[PDB]
Design a protein around this ligand. Structure first.
Ligand SMILES: C[S@@+](CC[C@H](N)C(=O)[O-])C[C@H]1O[C@@H](n2cnc3c(N)ncnc32)[C@H](O)[C@@H]1O
Ligand SMILES: C[S@@+](CC[C@H](N)C(=O)[O-])C[C@H]1O[C@@H](n2cnc3c(N)ncnc32)[C@H](O)[C@@H]1O
Ligand SMILES: CC(O)(O)CC(C)(O)O
Lengths: 200, 200
């Protein structure tokens, strides 16, 4: 399995979404959509061995976690508007639940689940599953050279993970990896990771 | 410089663009937008050494070529909707011109130019300019072994370049290059080639 966690610092946590302004009023929802698209889609299918987690911290009701399960996804297409609509549906589902129910993974559409869950607790749940945590940044060994097994890849947004959560990953001894000499968009990082793994 | 030619077999060639259906009624315009996005944008800036050409073959007025000049682009953002609006403006400009004027590059917005030009003639112009033509194709030589210089990269759409234009590319001895054992989306290929070149 190939798994990803993307921390979306500013992305809207309400279904009151303006599809005509995914970058602005939705808090860079466009970037999240591109990350989902690049995590899953190939020319003639979907990567059935991928799970993608988005942790949304924007207003008005953070945190919200959305889990996308590649082997189960239905009716999702690679374009931003379609993905944004599925994220809107997941937030609408979240809005229909009480806080007790929000403790669970709550299915919205096939392969898409929504839950009250923040970044650090999600990472701990993945460690409990036996996953190895790898995170991007700068100084790390290139992913091509690292022995990768049962991976969860941490991907930051434009502003980034933040100082606070950065040391947490240090403390749990998640492996630093690099992909490029340049600072790339998050979605590009996903594509490069997939390519390295595909070639192995 | 890093240059790309994307052949968009189905993409609309009028300004009658439905932003709510980039994939369908616009003829996979969403893919073209993703290719433009991935060709240019970095976390903090734009790749100023990139030129991207789109050759659009959809109805009602094909072919239309749009040249995007990285070092000149203004007000373009990486999201599909914004890029689609810039493409719509370019096609509107094209609609305002007579056929004599369409022989030229016609500026629409900063860094975006429109012209009546087909795929083979554009590649011939690039050959005359002294460029080397590389055709990104799944069964080419592994990119890591290819000595890339002064490149123009040919990228097909979902359907692909097609037999007629592949015949042409082989005749002019375009170099076939593989990026992955899997058949990827066109935009992913752009990201992979940028990474190869960035690492060099
Ligand atoms: S940038 C800040 C957005 C995110 O993309 C990832 N990223 C950007 N450039 C990278 C690079 N050159 N190497 C590894 N990860 C990168 C980081 O996770 C970062 O949080
Ligand atoms: S597919 C048809 C879309 C386009 O992506 C490019 N492409 C897809 N997979 C590739 C691969 N594995 N290696 C090189 N280019 C690829 C080709 O240019 C193709 O025309
Ligand atoms: C389109 C065409 O005329 O079929 C091309 C050729 C070379 O003449 O076959």
């Amino acid at each position: 399995m190939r798994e990803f966690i993307f921390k979306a610092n500013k992305t809207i946590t309400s279904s009151d979404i303006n599809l005509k302004d995914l970058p602005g009023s939705c808090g860079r929802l466009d970037l999240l959509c591109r990350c989902v698209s690049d995590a899953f889609f190939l020319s003639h299918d979907i990567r059935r061995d991928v799970v993608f987690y988005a942790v949304l911290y924007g207003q008005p009701n953070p945190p919200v976690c959305i889990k996308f399960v590649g082997s189960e996804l239905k009716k999702v297409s690679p374009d931003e508007r379609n993905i944004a609509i599925f994220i809107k549906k997941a937030l609408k589902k979240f809005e229909e639940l009480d806080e007790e129910q929000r403790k669970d993974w709550n299915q919205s559409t096939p392969g898409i689940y929504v839950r009250r869950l923040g970044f650090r607790n999600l990472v701990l749940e993945k460690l409990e599953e036996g996953k190895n945590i790898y995170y991007l940044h700068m100084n790390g060994e290139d992913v091509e050279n690292v022995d990768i097994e049962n991976p969860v890849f941490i991907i930051g947004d434009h502003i980034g993970i933040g100082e606070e959560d950065e040391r947490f990953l240090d403390e749990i001894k998640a492996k630093r990896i690099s992909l490029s000499p340049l600072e790339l968009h998050a979605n590009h990082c996903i594509t490069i990771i997939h390519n390295v793994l595909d070639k192995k």
